[PDB]
């Protein structure tokens, strides 16, 4: 659902506030092919340390679910860049699946990844997603067998999102290699990119998109409201400009 060779910034919404997240997205939009927007959650059992801290930060400052949608809606007044909402299942579950996805679509959300909703528990989610005009993103890890990766690919309508267990691990390039071989869908990699060598190397080995999360949220964690310019310098480094 995004142009090949793209860089995909991942930011946590409401870190440190909703106005700041909108500022960051607008500043990064000229560099990006798509955007992932994280929804804060109390107990995020997947995420690594730097993203985990941002969930803690955003909720400590009183983030609310309706503010994520406000960010996507106010961003859409300027840009039509693809937005992918990254969330845990409980916000979706408590609001009602259709109600959540409809409200997400109205804001201008293009795709959605439910982090802790397995493939075998997502038969209904993918079904309603299609009905409400929302594309699905499912993730695969290096331990994911070839049997499941096909089933993951079959249910995905946006892109498959590859991640690592942990410069860039040997086991992570094997996952990417297998994915391009098996998957009909496009592939975005979230292997913990910190430098230009990695972005080039992953595009070379066939990643359709390279996601940049930790490197940007580390900066947002250090600088807060003042991160905008430091984020740009970081995205310029990773694009090699």
């Amino acid at each position: 659902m995004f142009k090949d060779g793209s860089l995909i910034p991942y930011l946590t919404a409401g870190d440190p506030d909703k106005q700041s997240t909108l500022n960051f997205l607008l500043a990064l939009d000229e560099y990006a092919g798509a955007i992932e927007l994280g929804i804060p959650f109390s107990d995020p059992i997947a995420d690594g340390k730097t993203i985990q801290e941002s969930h803690y930060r955003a909720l400590k400052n009183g983030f609310k679910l309706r503010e994520a949608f406000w960010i996507v809606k106010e961003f859409r007044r300027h840009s039509s860049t693809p937005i992918v909402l990254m969330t845990y299942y409980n916000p979706i579950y408590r609001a009602g699946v259709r109600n959540f996805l409809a409200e997400a679509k109205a804001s201008g959300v293009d795709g959605i990844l439910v982090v802790d909703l397995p493939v075998f528990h997502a038969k209904e989610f993918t079904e309603i997603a299609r009905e409400e005009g929302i594309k699905t993103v499912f993730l695969a890890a290096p331990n994911t067998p070839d049997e499941r990766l096909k089933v993951i690919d079959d249910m995905t309508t946006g892109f498959v999102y590859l991640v690592s267990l942990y410069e860039i691990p040997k086991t992570a390039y094997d996952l990417l290699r297998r994915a391009k071989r098996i998957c009909r869908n496009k592939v975005a990699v979230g292997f913990g990119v910190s430098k230009r060598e990695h972005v080039v190397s992953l595009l070379k080995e066939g990643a359709n998109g390279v996601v940049v999360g930790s490197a940007l949220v580390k900066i947002i964690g250090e600088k807060g409201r003042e991160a905008t310019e430091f984020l740009k310098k970081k995205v310029e480094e990773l694009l090699g400009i």
Binding site: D43, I45, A46, G48, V115, D116, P118, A141, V163
Partner: protein, 385 residues
């Protein structure tokens, strides 16, 4: 993996393969002649099973109502029912060919249990603990290091239990080929809620044999405290099909339900998905985990096992609350009256049993599950009293 509508396996793709390996391993070794022989050897020879069913003769006369039996899980090795599951999973891990156990802990009670079990079966034990919790639990931390385990303080975020969980899961995701992750209660993704129940079911089997031995009939009520559900499911499960037996799970009422400082997840929570399970959780308006409170550290947990949610739903078990104050009276009352210092978690069960017993006939029978001893709670009870 379901208990009615509750349970499931709500984890990311990174955790699927380790759980699927555990599902398979449990399936083959669950009814294995040699596995159960070893499990029953250790439970008897190392843990001290069976535990006695004690008739609280003085306590029942005091109240003037029903007979009150205590299932004495305070007498197992370690001083709590947690040993039963600790051994069970640690042995399963060894039968899987694992060389290492990991877990996470807040109060330290599960960390000690895990360390003990790892020491017995000769396994490396790394236990993740929040940096706040390490300073709080000076004595539990030391206790783990004595047993050969080494604690890893996690210094990120809240520095609470929840941060230690994340470190433990990231560690398991990478090391699961030679490492098993040990869950303390009947909580989390499948197969942990079923596995833990099955390793605690001894309590109820023994108690059923013992009450038939003492009374010639099944009891009218069974009372047990509920945090995550472990001890409650252990004693409840064998009586589930016995239509006579009333089941009463007792949660932490804390400072009172009106105050909002408690851990009564079944009484006051909403159904939601956290920690890999659809179950009852204590949440704010926005569907985020709330802070919880209880004087009993083992009951200080916002979730509850999905099987208890199911029993609540179909009304097989009744769930109630008891306050810090009430549990504290029971702590003192049992110590004076029966010469048994109960754990503050168990004191919740004793406290409600005592209220219930007053309203019952003198020929009726209550079994209270005394989930542990309260030697560990003396620092807490001294400060408050």
């Amino acid at each position: 993996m379901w208990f009615g509508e509750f349970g499931g396996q709500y984890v990311p793709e990174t955790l699927i393969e380790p759980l699927k390996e555990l599902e398979k391993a449990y399936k083959r070794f669950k009814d294995d002649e040699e596995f159960n022989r070893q499990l029953n050897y250790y439970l008897k020879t190392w843990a001290g099973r069976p535990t006695p069913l004690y008739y609280a003769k003085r306590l029942t006369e005091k109240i003037g109502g029903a007979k009150i039996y205590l299932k004495r899980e305070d007498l197992v090795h370690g001083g709590a029912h947690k040993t039963n599951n600790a051994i069970g999973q640690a042995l399963l891990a060894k039968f899987m060919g694992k060389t290492r156990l990991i877990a996470e802990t807040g109060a330290g009670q599960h960390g000690v249990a895990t360390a003990m079990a790892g020491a017995l079966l000769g396994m490396k034990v790394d236990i993740y603990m929040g940096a706040e919790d390490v300073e709080r639990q000076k004595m539990n931390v030391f206790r783990m290091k004595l047993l050969g385990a080494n604690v890893i303080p996690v210094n990120s975020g809240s520095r609470t239990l929840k941060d230690a969980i994340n470190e433990a899961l990231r560690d398991w995701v990478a090391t699961f080929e030679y490492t098993h992750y040990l869950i303390g209660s009947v909580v989390g993704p499948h197969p942990y809620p079923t596995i833990v129940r099955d390793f605690q079911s001894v309590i109820g089997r023994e108690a059923k044999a013992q009450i038939l031995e003492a009374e010639g009939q099944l009891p009218d009520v069974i009372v047990a405290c509920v945090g995550g559900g472990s001890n409650a499911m252990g004693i409840f499960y064998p009586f589930v099909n016995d239509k006579k037996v009333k089941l009463v799970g007792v949660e932490a009422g804390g400072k009172g339900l009106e105050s909002g400082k408690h851990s009564a997840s079944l009484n006051a929570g909403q159904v939601g998905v956290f920690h890999g399970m659809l179950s009852y959780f204590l949440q704010d308006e926005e569907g985020q985990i709330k802070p919880t409170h209880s004087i009993a550290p083992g009951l200080d947990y916002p979730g509850v096992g999905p099987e208890h949610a199911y029993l609540k739903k179909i009304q097989r078990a009744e769930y109630v609350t008891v306050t810090d104050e009430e549990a504290l009276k029971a702590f003192h009352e049992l110590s004076r009256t029966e010469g048994i210092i109960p754990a503050l978690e168990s004191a919740h069960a004793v406290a409600y049993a005592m209220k219930l017993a007053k309203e019952m006939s003198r020929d009726e029978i209550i079994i209270v599950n005394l989930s542990g001893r309260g030697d560990k709670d003396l620092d807490i009870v001294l400060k408050v009293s």
